Amino acid sequence: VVGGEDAKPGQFPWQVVLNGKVDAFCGGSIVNEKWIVTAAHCVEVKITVVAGEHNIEETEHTEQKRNVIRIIPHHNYNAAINKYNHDIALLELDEPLVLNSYVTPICIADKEYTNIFLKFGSGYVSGWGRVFHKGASALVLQYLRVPLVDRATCLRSTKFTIYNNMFCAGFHEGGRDSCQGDSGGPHVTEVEGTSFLTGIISWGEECAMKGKYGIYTKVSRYVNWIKEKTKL
Amino acid sequence: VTCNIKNGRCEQFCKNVVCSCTEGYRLAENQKSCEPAVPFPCGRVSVSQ
Ligand SMILES: Cc1ccc(-c2ncnc(Nc3ccc(C(=N)N)cc3Cl)c2O)cc1
């Protein structure tokens, strides 16, 4: 996250970090004790998930690390056709997480209400991704409130194709944005003190560049699939 | 009186009004608000900030 703030301990207890060939290469969100939702391009290789993380370089005794035993990319994901379209995947953990003030699921409304909450126009993104374009990754979890950008403005910002179940978010003058390493993490909307997952952090061009926006997957498009595959 | 105006005054979900809440919450005494029904309900911060 470029131009964000340090999250306080337990401020985004649904956030997880993914470790693979490189540590902290993507984020994710807790759906329930056994399941994480992330971007499919992140898990397209052995992965471990860390819940309850705040500072990736210091043991705070709130962390819960788990092995991923199953990866379910959405059946319409095909990286050979488009790396970032239908970009959502689920990870099943070897042992359940223990829910507490540092490890708590994100709410997921039905298709209709997830779209209504996205249209409130203001969401929170978080992750340990790059804090500058081509820069270092964060040690403390970062967060940023990003406004939703209208589709017409979004389409004019890039030569790449923005599908209808993707959305743009960010600032007209850049300076603040998601970045590589935040991908797969959550875009959430606060509804009277309860956060709901409204997007997956997906892709973009130059982080925080004026005229460019972060691109996100609409969670409303995948709610039935998430609830079907993650049923306990 | 209707979900199409102020969400029928429901804190979370409305149905034509009958208010409802997401899993881990129950409909409060006032039939509009949502309150925790489990120790750690989804989407809430419980550490002191
Ligand atoms: C395994 C794997 C393969 C590829 C990648 C990957 N490569 C590039 N950019 C990425 N993301 C990204 C870029 C820019 C912005 C923005 N302009 N706001 C936001 C995001 Cl999330 C990204 O997730 C990650 C993991």
PDB file of C-alpha atoms and ligand atoms in Angstrom, chain A residues 25-26 41-44 83-84 177-184 201-208 212-216, ligand 1:
ATOM      1  CA  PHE A  25       4.102 -12.117  -1.820  1.00  0.00           C
ATOM      2  CA  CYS A  26       0.262 -11.827  -1.604  1.00  0.00           C
ATOM      3  CA  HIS A  41      -2.886 -15.236  -9.888  1.00  0.00           C
ATOM      4  CA  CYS A  42      -1.244 -15.521  -6.420  1.00  0.00           C
ATOM      5  CA  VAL A  43      -1.643 -19.300  -6.222  1.00  0.00           C
ATOM      6  CA  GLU A  44      -1.235 -20.202  -9.948  1.00  0.00           C
ATOM      7  CA  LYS A  83      -3.849 -13.512 -15.805  1.00  0.00           C
ATOM      8  CA  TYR A  84      -6.257 -11.156 -13.970  1.00  0.00           C
ATOM      9  CA  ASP A 177      -2.951   3.062  -3.752  1.00  0.00           C
ATOM     10  CA  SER A 178      -2.682  -0.698  -3.410  1.00  0.00           C
ATOM     11  CA  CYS A 179       0.514  -2.242  -4.863  1.00  0.00           C
ATOM     12  CA  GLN A 180       2.159  -5.577  -5.680  1.00  0.00           C
ATOM     13  CA  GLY A 181       2.206  -7.780  -2.556  1.00  0.00           C
ATOM     14  CA  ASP A 182      -1.255  -6.532  -1.467  1.00  0.00           C
ATOM     15  CA  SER A 183      -2.855  -8.639  -4.295  1.00  0.00           C
ATOM     16  CA  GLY A 184      -5.352 -11.201  -3.029  1.00  0.00           C
ATOM     17  CA  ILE A 201      -7.187  -6.575  -4.467  1.00  0.00           C
ATOM     18  CA  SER A 202      -6.230  -7.718  -8.013  1.00  0.00           C
ATOM     19  CA  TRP A 203      -3.873  -5.686 -10.275  1.00  0.00           C
ATOM     20  CA  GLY A 204      -2.852  -2.348 -11.734  1.00  0.00           C
ATOM     21  CA  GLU A 205      -0.139  -0.566 -13.638  1.00  0.00           C
ATOM     22  CA  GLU A 206       2.276   1.908 -11.885  1.00  0.00           C
ATOM     23  CA  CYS A 207       1.281   2.067  -8.204  1.00  0.00           C
ATOM     24  CA  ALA A 208      -0.001   5.495  -7.120  1.00  0.00           C
ATOM     25  CA  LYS A 212      -4.025   5.158 -12.972  1.00  0.00           C
ATOM     26  CA  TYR A 213      -6.147   3.250 -10.450  1.00  0.00           C
ATOM     27  CA  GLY A 214      -5.987  -0.034  -8.594  1.00  0.00           C
ATOM     28  CA  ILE A 215      -8.193  -2.769 -10.166  1.00  0.00           C
ATOM     29  CA  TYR A 216     -10.225  -5.083  -7.965  1.00  0.00           C
TER      30      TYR A 216
HETATM   31  C1  LIG C   1       2.570 -15.001  -8.131  1.00  0.00           C
HETATM   32  C2  LIG C   1       2.243 -13.562  -8.462  1.00  0.00           C
HETATM   33  C3  LIG C   1       2.323 -13.090  -9.765  1.00  0.00           C
HETATM   34  C4  LIG C   1       2.118 -11.752 -10.059  1.00  0.00           C
HETATM   35  C5  LIG C   1       1.823 -10.834  -9.053  1.00  0.00           C
HETATM   36  C6  LIG C   1       1.619  -9.392  -9.356  1.00  0.00           C
HETATM   37  N1  LIG C   1       2.438  -8.863 -10.282  1.00  0.00           N
HETATM   38  C7  LIG C   1       2.265  -7.569 -10.559  1.00  0.00           C
HETATM   39  N2  LIG C   1       1.394  -6.714 -10.015  1.00  0.00           N
HETATM   40  C8  LIG C   1       0.588  -7.257  -9.080  1.00  0.00           C
HETATM   41  N3  LIG C   1      -0.307  -6.450  -8.418  1.00  0.00           N
HETATM   42  C9  LIG C   1      -0.570  -5.066  -8.411  1.00  0.00           C
HETATM   43  C10 LIG C   1       0.114  -4.163  -9.229  1.00  0.00           C
HETATM   44  C11 LIG C   1      -0.213  -2.818  -9.222  1.00  0.00           C
HETATM   45  C12 LIG C   1      -1.240  -2.341  -8.413  1.00  0.00           C
HETATM   46  C13 LIG C   1      -1.725  -0.947  -8.544  1.00  0.00           C
HETATM   47  N4  LIG C   1      -1.330  -0.205  -9.551  1.00  0.00           N
HETATM   48  N5  LIG C   1      -2.572  -0.465  -7.663  1.00  0.00           N
HETATM   49  C14 LIG C   1      -1.903  -3.228  -7.573  1.00  0.00           C
HETATM   50  C15 LIG C   1      -1.568  -4.563  -7.578  1.00  0.00           C
HETATM   51 CL1  LIG C   1      -2.404  -5.623  -6.498  1.00  0.00          CL
HETATM   52  C16 LIG C   1       0.643  -8.614  -8.714  1.00  0.00           C
HETATM   53  O1  LIG C   1      -0.234  -9.102  -7.804  1.00  0.00           O
HETATM   54  C17 LIG C   1       1.729 -11.316  -7.748  1.00  0.00           C
HETATM   55  C18 LIG C   1       1.929 -12.654  -7.463  1.00  0.00           C
END
